[PDB]
């Protein structure tokens, strides 16, 4: 049963610096600034039809578009590049490039010099925007969610996706890889079940991942491959929708099908809650892994039936950090949190009911 898209939202994505988000819909595409929450432009159904995927390149005029939903103008096997800064009387003049594949596109990732196209069992990497050429192609395990993350750093060209072994990650340095050569992806055995979420931090020094069990989030150093931390979202299984780092890598947020967004401290891990059993010192040989688990510093609730992406906002002050949740039901949630674990709603809006203020 494909859940009918709540309010017609088919996909949600933050841009690379989490400062904008894009919304693919049954009625086209919408682009929002996160702080302040404001519509920055849309593509209507008359321009693009129903859309399955949208990815924005940073804060530029370049969008990668994949047709999908109930009434698409474009194929689910084509990635179209829209250039919104092009003057043209016809919407077709803003379509600057097309990448066509033999299977449906499940995710697109962009950075300043590259576009990455994810199919169910293959990942393609091209140079972008100028004179696009295929640089690399990678085989994957069954990747039906298009799971891939691409480091946005100028200094590191790290790609991460699900590896061939169940619950493994493959990491590829695209700068160290000669074009047309297989630089061997290095493998991290992150989980025992299939990967559900993966994210890199901004410098590409740390990878976070969660499996389909969604009880644990594991962080690894991307160079040494060592497990840095194991975070516990909950006791109970949960489908994670999103995991993201803060810009400074001090925190990690995680959204799930429990209607909860969890916040973890990564830099000062003492801010994370620990099980009370960790204070009842080492009574017996079998409780060791539950005692060392770090629980969320803070958490807040969102509508439980609404899938949501989560990210960090801009630091408003020296000790107050913000987390945004964008939900497929059209709701925007902003929470402020502090190192003592207080977490309070700062803003709530219905981002789909934000019209362009054609009044000023």
């Amino acid at each position: 049963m494909t859940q009918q898209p709540l309010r017609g939202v088919t996909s949600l994505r933050f841009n690379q610096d989490q400062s904008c988000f894009c919304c693919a819909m049954e009625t086209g595409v919408r682009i929002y600034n996160v702080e302040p929450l404001m519509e920055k432009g849309h593509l209507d159904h008359e321009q693009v039809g129903s859309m399955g995927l949208v990815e924005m390149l940073h804060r530029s005029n370049l969008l990668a578009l994949v047709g999908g939903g109930s009434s698409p103008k474009f194929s689910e096997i084509s990635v179209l590049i829209w250039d919104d800064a092009r003057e043209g009387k016809d919407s077709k003049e803003k379509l600057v490039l097309e990448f066509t594949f033999t299977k449906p596109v499940l995710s697109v990732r962009m950075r300043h010099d590259k576009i990455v196209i994810v199919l169910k069992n293959r990942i393609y990497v091209y140079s972008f925007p100028d004179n696009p050429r295929k640089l690399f192609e990678f085989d994957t395990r069954d990747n039906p969610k298009g799971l891939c993350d691409l480091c946005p750093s100028l200094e590191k060209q790290l790609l991460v996706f699900p590896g061939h072994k169940c619950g493994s990650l493959q990491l590829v340095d695209l700068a160290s890889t000669k074009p047309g050569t297989s630089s061997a992806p290095f493998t991290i055995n992150a989980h025992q079940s299939d990967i559900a979420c993966v994210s890199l931090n901004q410098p590409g020094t740390v990878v976070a991942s969660a499996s389909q069990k969604g009880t644990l989030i594991r962080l690894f150093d991307t160079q040494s491959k060592e497990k840095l931390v194991e975070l516990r979202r909950g006791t109970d299984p949960a489908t994670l929708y999103c995991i993201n780092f803060s810009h400074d890598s001090s925190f990690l947020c995680a959204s799930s099908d429990k209607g909860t967004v969890h916040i973890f401290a990564l830099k000062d891990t003492r801010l994370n809650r620990r099980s009370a059993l960790a204070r009842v010192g080492k009574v017996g040989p079998m409780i060791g892994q539950y005692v060392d688990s770090q629980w969320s510093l803070a958490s807040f609730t969102v509508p439980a039936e609404s899938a949501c992406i989560c990210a960090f906002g801009r630091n408003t002050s020296k000790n107050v950090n913000s987390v945004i949740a964008i939900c497929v039901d059209g709701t925007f949630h902003k929470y402020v949190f502090t190192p003592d674990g207080n977490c309070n709603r700062e803003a709530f809006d219905v981002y789909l009911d934000i019209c362009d203020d054609d009044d000023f």
């Binding site: 092009r86 003057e87 043209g88 009387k89 016809d90 003049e93």
Partner: protein, 152 residues
């Protein structure tokens, strides 16, 4: 007398077809200006192709983004100017001597505006006059004169 081939294939000027009032779409499937000046042989001058130069409504325009539009190196590009002079000599009365978005919408592969084209004979760019409204039926030249542009 002159010989200068010009073609306009499948110009589906379905005036008042619908665009609500007199869509009158030029919808020019091909507007290749085959020749001008003294040259009768076809050489691609411009204003499948779908060059809806005058796709209208009620007030609009467009362009077909052909790979090369203005290849003016044949005989005299001002030979059509002297043709217009002989026209006003023959046609004694010559009076004409939403937002438009009247784009030129073609990455012009070019090769007095005619003098500069002759001297230069890619080399120009499409205006992309989104909602410019620089034209007013007599102010088309005014809208063309907006800002400045040059390339190569």
């Amino acid at each position: 007398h002159v010989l200068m081939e010009i073609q306009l294939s499948k110009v589906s000027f379905q005036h008042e077809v619908y665009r609500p009032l007199s869509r009158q779409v030029f919808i020019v499937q091909e507007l290749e200006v085959r020749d001008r000046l003294a040259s009768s042989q076809i050489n691609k001058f411009l204003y499948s192709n779908m060059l809806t130069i005058k796709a209208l409504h009620v007030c609009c325009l467009r362009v077909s983004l052909m790979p090369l539009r203005l290849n003016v190196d044949q005989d005299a590009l001002f030979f059509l100017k002297d043709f217009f002079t002989s026209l006003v000599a023959g046609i004694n009365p010559v009076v004409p001597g939403r937002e438009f978005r009247f784009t030129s919408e073609v990455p012009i592969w070019l090769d007095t505006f005619a003098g500069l084209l002759i001297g230069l004979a890619s080399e120009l760019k499409l205006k992309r006059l989104c909602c410019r409204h620089g034209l007013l039926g007599v102010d088309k030249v005014l809208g063309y004169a907006l800002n400045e542009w040059l390339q190569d």
